[PDB]
Amino acid sequence: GAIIENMSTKKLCIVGGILLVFQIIAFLVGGLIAPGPTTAVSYMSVKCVDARKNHHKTKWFVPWGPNHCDKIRDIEEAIPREIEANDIVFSVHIPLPHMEMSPWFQFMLFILQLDIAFKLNNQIRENAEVSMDVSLAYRDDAFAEWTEMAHERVPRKLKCTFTSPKTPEHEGRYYECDVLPFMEIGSVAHKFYLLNIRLPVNEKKKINVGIGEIKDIRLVGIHQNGGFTKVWFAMKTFLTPSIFIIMVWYWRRITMMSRPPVLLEKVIFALGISMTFINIPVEWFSIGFDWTWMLLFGDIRQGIFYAMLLSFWIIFCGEHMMDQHERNHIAGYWKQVGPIAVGSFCLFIFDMCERGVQLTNPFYSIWTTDIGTELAMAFIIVAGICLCLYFLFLCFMVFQVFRNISGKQSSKVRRLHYEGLIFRFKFLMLITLACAAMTVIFFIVSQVTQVNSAFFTGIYGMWNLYVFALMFLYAPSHKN
């Protein structure tokens, strides 16, 4: 006597309506509060020069404020000053004047933009490479000392092409050539960050040679909106107790039953507990504490939740097969489920490994070592094709289930009861395919993101509401 088979349609439709109302408000809160999760911002570098006195001990340089460096007006002004290579250092004080960085901005993304002046004297080498010397620092008090975060060599190949002709009337115009994936930071913890870049030249070690005249460098930054992060955290801390309440209701009601439960009522509970496992607001630590690995843990949680869900759809749909079906244990369905769980983990493995390795090298990326870029594109394509094939396989399963249940009907309480159960199945199954399609779209979109709309909030609400509806529907009913 579950809900789905005892409950009257009058009881059903009000619950459906209120749940859909929750889904719609969870959709539109993203558009309301923060219509766009990532804040794009651009910092122009300041061209400092040093006194050539800091060889054994390195020294930081600040663009503006007190004790700010001396700034070369242009790369030609250095010549009357007789400035030599390696005297020039680029500087980017990350926060703009009269504001600060906030821990609410969870992560930081940086890509370089290069302004290299064309001249016939410095034609770009066919495999020209900028062997940049980069260092980073962080600070919390406006009068504190800069503390080192990273100081390493970072290679980068120029993928680069100037269209306009080489005639010297066209010199000085910049090469049109590309942005470069520069840096990822796992988490934000400090008010001020400083970044200093040098490009030492050495014809012996073949570093920064034939790269053209680098006029200026420009840094483009992306970080999560202060609005979106707060609302996301608030929605998760809202949804966690609600799902736990519905889960305890479900499990208490199930445990009240006289007879033991079948595979289905166990797999739905597994879905619920995994959904809570992702739901719990563990990430609220990031604002109050310096923990850094949490950004990888979110990807771990999403991978595990996907592993639960993609198996759940097949098991739930598969269990609606009735002829000579209804096994006692996963040995009857490990045939299908087995690689699905492994595959679901495999979707995020590359992104998770990137997140891991960026804690030892923030400048590491898959998009360097260009074979890395082409294999990343190949990975995106195979993941897409495999997930679409899984969606097709689920659609085939639904098709076969629809084929099958024609027999039970074709082979006044019976008239309304059986037809109502059939209608319940039909609506639930249609909801299932719709949610699966939206989940596939979500995976692809989360991998590609130019979406400017915050539909993430709505689709997460959709997952919560769907799992909620399942536990609500499959619990035993109050005695009539």
Q: Which domains does the chain have, with CATH numbers?
A: 3-37+227-474 (1.20.1070), 38-224 (2.60.120)
Structure-block tokens of residue 103 = 């821990």
Residues 176 and 161: beta-carbon distance below 8 Å: yes
Report d(CA 396, CA 388) in Å as an integer: 12
- In the block, which residue shows the tokens 């960085």? 101
Measured CA angle at 123 (ends 118, 129), to 5 deg: 100
Q: Cβ(136)–Cβ(194) under 8 Å?
A: yes
User: Nearest CA to 105 among 196, 181, 41?
Assistant: 41
Helix (H) and strand (E) counts in the chain: 10, 9
Point out which residues pair with 129 in neighbouring strands.
Answer: 157
Element (H, E) at 138: strand 132-139
How big is the chain by its Cα radius of gyration, in Å? Answer: 29
399 token code pair: 């098709």
Handedness of CA 356, 359, 364, 367 (dihedral sign): positive
Phi and psi at residue 54, in whole multiples of 5°? -120, 45
Q: Where are the alpha helices (DSSP H) in 179-293?
A: 226-255, 263-279, 285-288
Closest CA to 362 of 185, 97, 113, 99: 185
How far is 397 from 314, CA to CA, in rounded Å? 8
Strand partners, 168: none
Assign residue 207 a region (left: φ > 0; alpha: ψ between -120 and 50; beta: otherwise): beta
Q: Determination technique for this PDB entry? A: cryo-EM
Would you call 288 exposed, middle or buried from its count of C-beta atoms within 10 A (0-12, 13-18, 19+)? Answer: exposed
End-to-end C-alpha distance for the chain, whole angstroms: 10
Residue whose entry in the numeric block shows the structure tokens 């199945």: 425
CB 212 within 8 A of CB 175: yes
- Residues 6+ away with beta carbon under 8 Å from 215: 75, 115, 116, 117, 174
Q: Determine the Cα–Cα distance for residues 394 and 310; give it in Å rounded to an integer.
A: 10
Q: How far is Cα 442 from Cα 435, in angstroms, rounded to an integer?
A: 10
Q: Is 6 exposed, middle or buried (0-12, 13-18, 19+ CB in 10 A)?
A: middle
